[PDB]
Amino acid sequence: PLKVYSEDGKLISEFGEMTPELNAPYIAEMARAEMVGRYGSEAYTEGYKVITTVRSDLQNAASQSVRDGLIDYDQRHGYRGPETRLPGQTRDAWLKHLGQQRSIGGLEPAIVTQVEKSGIMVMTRDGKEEAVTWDSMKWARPFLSNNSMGPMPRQPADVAQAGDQIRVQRQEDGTLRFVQIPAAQSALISLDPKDGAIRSLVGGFSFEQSNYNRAIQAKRQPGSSFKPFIYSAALDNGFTAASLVNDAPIVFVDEYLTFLGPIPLREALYKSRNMVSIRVLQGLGIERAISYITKFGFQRDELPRNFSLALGTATVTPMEIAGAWSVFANGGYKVNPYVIERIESRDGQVLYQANPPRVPVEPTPAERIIDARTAYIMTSMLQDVIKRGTGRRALALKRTDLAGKTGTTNDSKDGWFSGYNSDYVTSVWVGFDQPETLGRREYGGTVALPIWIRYMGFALKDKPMHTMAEPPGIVSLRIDPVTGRSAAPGTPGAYFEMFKNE
């Protein structure tokens, strides 16, 4: 009977062929699959022991973050009604129905037994009847469309009726809050950028729903969370953090066989200026870009061979994105994300000890793909996204070492946040499986970034500031904001900027 364990030693699950301390089904499945590829059906029989890269504390932080974040978003959009309406049915029968219902993401099924002007009485699977306050029901305004909502409910009867099958969430003070299972989905992945080990993975709201692992299976458009790769290529192909690029509309042609306006490359990056991103790619040329980009972990077959590439219209997985961002985090090295740390035998003999490519402090040396100075300047700029840009909500963590980037696809069809420090790389996706707008007022920063912040808050709790150390070969010089070139003394507006020795 296959036993899957976390790095810290907690039992995730067991697999066999004809009690979990840590709930990590997405991780569990990844191990089961990997083991089967390695040993066959004999993996389930022999009693092997798999030791994963995940840490229990971090795993539950991820789990909670995604759940809370999906619930927060869901409520903002209203109530979509009960799961079942069982009026006139006996308590014994209600208990019968409830018996075949399961908890989905800490959200327990309950049947409304009574509706009072003060609240509701609900029965759980156990048969226990408990009160639910009108306060926890006040949010339950009618959902009409991802953009339209009904009026605020004025009494519990407006929201629920006896026989209604609802959801209740227990709190730290034993009380039950009136909830609903979100229709939106999310994906969280956190890595150690040193070797590419997955420290936490969440492939949806509940495995307890579908077994689909959106962290590794779902290919979504990264939008602006992709720009760094274009800008990194820029820094490595003639441009500088100072390079002035006109943010203005782009006229275009086909011929046989926007404010700001001209701004520094750094300004454009934290400000997600698409016109700049197009012009940079233009100068770089599609091919050169793709060849540079793929080296980060992306597949040539996912990268659009046109202008749209600059806008992040590629189809990628949160694991691919996280794997790639790790390049900037670890100072320029390609790491291969992994989940099996150890495979032990029946008796305890070590059958497998993962030796991944590792960044410098026998182990496999990690290949360097980009200039250490590139990784440093790139980090510098991406920290501004938190400091000045779209990541201002992440300043709440009171940390200096944070670098990141929000991403919002057209019509808010996807919401992203990808970021790090030298400790962890965390990639957060939010959206609908069948794409639809998350809402007019919804962005990567309003859906994903909150989840990300919650998780990074916990992960980096007792962690001191850890950013990349300045590598040899960087120079900070005064620049004329108007010319983008070295500023003579007495230049108004002159500012300092880092550069690779020209």
Ligand SMILES: *C(=O)[C@H](CO/N=C(\C[C@@H](C(=O)O)N1C(=O)c2cc(O)c(O)cc2C1=O)C(=O)O)NC(=O)/C(=N\OC(C)(C)C(=O)O)c1csc(N)n1
């Ligand atoms: C990058 O993803 C690029 C720019 O938009 N990116 C983000 C949204 C963000 C911002 O641009 O700063 N943002 C707003 O525009 C905005 C307006 C507003 O009134 C309030 O209150 C807040 C915000 C806000 O946070 C980001 O997360 O970084 N996006 C795109 O290029 C694509 N679509 O753009 C829109 C704006 C979402 C759109 O509907 O057109 C895109 C890239 S691939 C694809 N299919 N679309």
